[PDB]
Amino acid sequence: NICLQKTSNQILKPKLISTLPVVGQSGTCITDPLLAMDEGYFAYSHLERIGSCGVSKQRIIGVGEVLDRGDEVPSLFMTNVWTPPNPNTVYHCSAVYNNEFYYVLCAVSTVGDPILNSTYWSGSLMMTRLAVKPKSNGGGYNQHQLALRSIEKGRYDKVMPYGPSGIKQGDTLYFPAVGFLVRTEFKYNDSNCPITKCQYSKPENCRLSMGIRPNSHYILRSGLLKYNLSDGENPKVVFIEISDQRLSIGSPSKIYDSLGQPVFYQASFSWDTMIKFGDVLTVNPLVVNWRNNTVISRPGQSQCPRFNTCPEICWEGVYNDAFLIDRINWISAGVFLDSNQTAENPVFTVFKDNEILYRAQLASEDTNAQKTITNCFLLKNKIWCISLVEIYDTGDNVIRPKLFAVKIPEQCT
Ligand SMILES: *[C@@H]1O[C@H](CO)[C@@H](O)[C@H](O)[C@H]1NC(C)=O
Ligand SMILES: *[C@@H]1O[C@H](CO)[C@@H](O)[C@H](O)[C@H]1NC(C)=O
Numbered sequence: 001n002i003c004l005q006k007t008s009n010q011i012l013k014p015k016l017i018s019t020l021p022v023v024g025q026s027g028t029c030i031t032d033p034l035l036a037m038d039e040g041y042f043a044y045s046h047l048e049r050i051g052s053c054g055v056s057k058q059r060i061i062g063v064g065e066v067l068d069r070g071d072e073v074p075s076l077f078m079t080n081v082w083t084p085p086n087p088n089t090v091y092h093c094s095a096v097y098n099n100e101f102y103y104v105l106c107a108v109s110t111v112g113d114p115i116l117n118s119t120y121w122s123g124s125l126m127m128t129r130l131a132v133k134p135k136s137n138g139g140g141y142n143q144h145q146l147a148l149r150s151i152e153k154g155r156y157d158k159v160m161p162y163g164p165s166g167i168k169q170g171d172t173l174y175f176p177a178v179g180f181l182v183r184t185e186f187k188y189n190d191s192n193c194p195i196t197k198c199q200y201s202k203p204e205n206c207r208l209s210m211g212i213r214p215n216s217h218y219i220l221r222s223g224l225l226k227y228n229l230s231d232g233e234n235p236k237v238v239f240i241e242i243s244d245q246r247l248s249i250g251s252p253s254k255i256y257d258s259l260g261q262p263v264f265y266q267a268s269f270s271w272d273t274m275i276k277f278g279d280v281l282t283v284n285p286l287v288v289n290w291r292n293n294t295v296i297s298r299p300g301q302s303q304c305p306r307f308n309t310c311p312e313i314c315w316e317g318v319y320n321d322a323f324l325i326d327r328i329n330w331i332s333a334g335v336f337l338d339s340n341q342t343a344e345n346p347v348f349t350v351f352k353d354n355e356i357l358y359r360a361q362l363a364s365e366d367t368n369a370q371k372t373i374t375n376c377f378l379l380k381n382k383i384w385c386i387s388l389v390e391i392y393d394t395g396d397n398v399i400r401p402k403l404f405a406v407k408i409p410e411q412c413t
C-alpha cells in the first residue's frame with residue numbers, strides 16, 4: 001500500500017547514498033553512466049576522463065549487491081569490477097541479470113561513437129559475463145568473455161545495444177537495442193505522420209526525423225537484442241525491431257520487469273516528447289501498449305521542447321526513465337528535469353497518466369542535470385526506488401552521477 005492521492009505534502013524523503021570512491025576525486029570527469037538492478041543485484045558502468053569531459057582514462061564495469069546499509073536504507077555494495085583494456089573502443093554497454101551472473105553487451109568501435117560515425121562502424125559487439133558473487137581464484141567463473149558466433153539482423157545494416165538494462169525470460173536475455181537501416185530502404189507512408197492539429201508541420205517530418213539528420217545515411221529503429229543461453233555452444237544474437245505504432249527515432253531504451261510483467265521505456269530524442277512507456281504486450285515481435293501520458297515530458301531545445309507533440313525535424317532530448325510501482329492503478333516513479341529548454345532541476349516524481357501525485361526536488365531550480373535512471377524494488381515489503389542522476393556542475397565544469405534512495409510512502413500525511 002502506497003499513497004494513491006495527489007498531495008503537496010513533502011512525504012518523499014530522498015536519501016543521498018553512494019558504488020566507487022573515484023566518483024568524488026577531483027581531476028577526473030565521470031560520464032556515460034549505466035545502472036541496472038534485478039533480484040537483489042546491480043550492474044554499474046562509467047567512463048572516467050582525466051580533465052575535460054575529453055580523454056578516456058578508464059572504463060569500469062562492475063556488479064554487486066543492493067543491501068540495507070544499516071539504518072533501513074538500501075545502498076550498493078560492489079562485489080566484482082572489470083576494466084576493459086582500451087576504454088576508447090567500448091560504447092553503449094547494456095546489462096541483463098540471469099542465474100548468478102550479469103551479462104554486459106557493448107559495442108566495439110575503432111571509429112568513435114557508432115551513433116555519430118555509423119557508416120564506418122564495423123558492427124562489432126562483445127559480451128562480458130560477471131559473477132555477482134565471485135570466488136577467490138575463480139578464473140573464468142568471475143569474469144568471462146562470451147563468443148558471439150553470429151548476429152541475426154535481417155534487413156538492418158548493423159545492430160547495437162542502446163540502453164542501460166534489459167530482462168531475462170528463463171534462459172533468454174533481452175537487451176534494449178537499435179538497428180541501423182539504410183534510409184533509402186525505410187518503408188514509410190507520410191500520410192501516417194500526425195499533423196492534423198499542427199499547421200507548421202510538413203507531412204515528411206516524421207520520416208526525416210527518424211535519423212539524426214534529415215539527410216542521414218541511416219534511420220534508427222529501437223528494439224531488442226535477443227540472446228538465448230540454451231541456443232548451442234556459442235549462442236547467436238538476434239535483433240527484434242519495435243513496432244511502428246507511435247514510432248520515434250531509435251533512442252536509448254529500457255525493458256524491465258515490474259510486478260511480474262515486462263515494461264518498456266524509450267527516450268524521446270525527437271518531436272514525440274511526452275513519455276514513451278508501457279507494458280509489453282509481446283516481446284517478439286515487440287509490441288508496447290504505450291501509455292497515453294499527458295503530464296510527463298523532458299527538456300529539449302527550440303524545435304522540440306518539453307510538452308511538444310507536433311512533428312518536427314530535431315534530434316534532442318534526454319534519457320529520464322520511469323519505473324512502474326503499481327500496475328493495478330498504473331502509478332510510476334522517476335526523476336524528471338523540471339524545465340522546458342534547459343537540462344535543469346531534477347525532481348523525483350510519482351505519477352499516473354493524467355496526474356502527478358507527489359514529488360520531491362533533489363537539488364535546486366538552477367542545478368544542471370542530465371541522464372536519470374530509476375529502479376524500484378521491495379526491501380522488507382516497503383517499496384524503495386534508487387535513482388542515478390547526472391549532476392553537472394557548471395561552476396566546476398564537471399559531470400558526476402549522484403545516487404538517491406527514496407522510499408515510496410504508505411501514507412499521504
Ligand atoms: C569517424 O569515422 C572515421 C572513419 O574512418 C574515422 O576516420 C574517424 O576517426 C572517426 N571520428 C572519430 C571522432 O572517432
Ligand atoms: C498512405 O497512408 C494513408 C494513411 O491514412 C492511406 O490512406 C494511404 O492509402 C496510404 N498509401 C500510400 C501512401 O501508398
Ligand SMILES: *[C@@H]1O[C@H](CO)[C@@H](O)[C@H](O)[C@H]1NC(C)=O
Nearest residue numbers: 169171172228229230231232
Ligand atoms: C532457446 O533455446 C532453446 C534450445 O534451442 C529452445 O528450446 C527455446 O525455445 C529457446 N527459447 C527462445 C525464447 O527462443
Ligand SMILES: *[C@@H]1O[C@H](CO)[C@@H](O)[C@H](O)[C@H]1NC(C)=O
Nearest residue numbers: 278279289290291292293353
Ligand atoms: C491510448 O490511446 C489510444 C487511442 O489513441 C487507445 O486506443 C489506447 O487503448 C490507449 N492506451 C492505453 C489506455 O493504455
Ligand SMILES: *[C@@H]1O[C@H](CO)[C@@H](O)[C@H](O)[C@H]1NC(C)=O
Nearest residue numbers: 305306307308338339340341
Ligand atoms: C514551459 O512550456 C509550457 C508549455 O508550452 C508553458 O506553458 C510554460 O509557460 C513554459 N514555462 C516557462 C517558465 O516559460
